[PDB]
């Protein structure tokens, strides 16, 4: 019935501002109330702020009104989020949601909300990094029956890379790890893949790092030493 | 103002299972209670609202209790699309607030991690800043320990560890414990040993090299 969906840009820079706008269907925009929810990396759910659809009337959490504008567009059936000055605290998935409410039983008073839909969410990251490509290293092993190996993609920015193991043909036993940004601003991550020993002086392992933003293709060949 | 706590954060179950998840408030707030169902990469869900009603839709096998500072979410007989992160949240006063979450996982029979160490290429030690990456593969349960040895010494700071979302498969994890050393750091030792703790290994495990070997 109700759909929703954010659009944003990926990336902002420290300082600057965050704008995240919400498209809504198959509803009466103006007749409920609007919703910005966030989860950073690693951190729980945040409510950010909330408004009319009807007169734009906003609220706001505290901890961010210092910062925070929530608008809304009826004819277009659009509300937006703009979050002033920025930082690294901000990176977060930013979802847009519909916000229900009732009577508490007090004189003049409701609740406040929860959210009954909301929409698939926009990752936004803060960071000043500039893009760059990855290097690529091999990481070479073999008593077992299983050896592993793999590929160290160092220093890129910004997310993602893929990895493919000898242009595909290789899938099973794969692990290709989350990134993790290192205090350059820049991410670092390893693919590894567990083979059989025996295979290890036959067969030819390499590993194809692609990275769209910075259009790098590299191919390293993994192999013992 | 009001803070909600959840428990456990985190849950291992199997399919079959009926589980409860816990939720208190720092303090009353009636039966303003509502419970979301959070997977990765996919819009959130309600699925229950004012601490008791089901959200159309949703499943009975789904079921809130309590009011004033205690609640509960129960799962009757566990499916595998319900292992997912579950999140309380008040809404008795403003601001909402969401408690900090329980991501249920799915048990297995312990196994412990399959151990190797890569010395940096010789590539990497030509550029003069090298990698030492210590691999644990294919382990369960998440939780386990590594500690990075240089000539004996315990090197603390420098390392960072990435640990891989559950295996939809085999339900195993795997974890990565990278060392940054400048070359020249790296080249004034000599053993350099990943140590690694875990449930499934009743003796601790080291893998070494001998710096150019």
């Known amino acids: 019935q109700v759909q929703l969906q954010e659009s944003g840009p990926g990336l902002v820079k420290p300082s600057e501002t965050l704008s995240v706008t919400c498209a809504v269907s198959?509803?009466?925009?103006?007749?409920?109330?609007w919703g910005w929810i966030r989860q950073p990396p690693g951190k729980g759910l945040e409510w950010v702020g909330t408004?009319?659809?009807?007169?734009?009337?906003?609220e706001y959490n505290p901890s961010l009104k210092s910062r925070t504008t929530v608008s809304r567009d009826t004819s277009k059936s659009q509300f937006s989020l703009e979050l002033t000055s920025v930082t690294a605290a901000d990176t977060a998935i930013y979802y847009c949601?519909?916000?229900?409410?009732?009577?508490?039983?007090?004189?003049?008073?409701?609740?406040?909300?929860?959210?009954?839909?909301w929409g698939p969410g926009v990752l936004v990251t803060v960071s000043s990094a500039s893009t760059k490509g990855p290097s690529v290293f091999p990481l070479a092993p073999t008593s077992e029956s299983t050896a592993a190996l793999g590929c160290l993609v160092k220093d890129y920015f910004p997310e993602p890379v893929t990895v493919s193991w000898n242009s595909g043909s290789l899938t099973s036993g794969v692990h290709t790890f989350p990134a993790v940004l290192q205090s350059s601003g820049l991410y670092s991550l390893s693919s590894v893949v567990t083979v059989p020993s025996s295979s290890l002086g036959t067969q030819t392992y390499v590993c194809n790092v692609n990275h769209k933003p910075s259009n790098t293709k590299v191919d390293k060949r993994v192999e013992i030493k | 103002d009001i803070q909600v706590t959840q428990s456990p954060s985190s849950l291992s179950a199997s399919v079959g299972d009926t589980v409860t998840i816990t939720c208190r408030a720092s303090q009353s707030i009636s039966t303003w209670l509502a419970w979301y169902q959070l997977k990765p990469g996919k819009a959130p869900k309600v699925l229950i609202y004012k601490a008791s009603s089901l959200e159309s839709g949703v499943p009975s096998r789904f079921s809130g209790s309590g009011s004033g500072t205690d609640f509960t979410l129960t799962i009757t007989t566990l499916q595998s699309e319900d292992f997912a992160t579950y999140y309380c949240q008040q809404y008795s006063s403003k601001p909402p607030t969401f408690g900090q979450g329980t991501k249920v996982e799915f048990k297995r029979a312990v196994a412990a991690p399959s151990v190797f160490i890569f010395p940096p290429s010789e590539d990497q030690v030509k550029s003069g800043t090298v990698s030492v990456v210590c691999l644990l593969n294919n382990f369960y349960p998440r939780e386990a320990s590594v500690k990075w040895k240089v000539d004996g010494v315990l090197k603390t700071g420098n390392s960072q560890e990435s640990v891989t979302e559950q295996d939809s498969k085999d339900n195993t994890y795997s974890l990565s414990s990278t060392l940054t050393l400048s070359n020249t750091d790296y080249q004034s030792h000599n053993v350099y040993a990943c140590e690694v703790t875990h449930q499934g290994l009743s003796s601790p495990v080291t893998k070494s090299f001998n710096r150019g070997e």
């Open positions: 198959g509803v009466s925009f103006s007749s409920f109330w």
């Open positions: 949601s519909r916000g229900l409410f009732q009577p508490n039983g007090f004189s003049f008073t409701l609740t406040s909300y929860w959210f009954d839909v």
């Open positions: 408004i009319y659809g009807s007169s734009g009337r906003a």
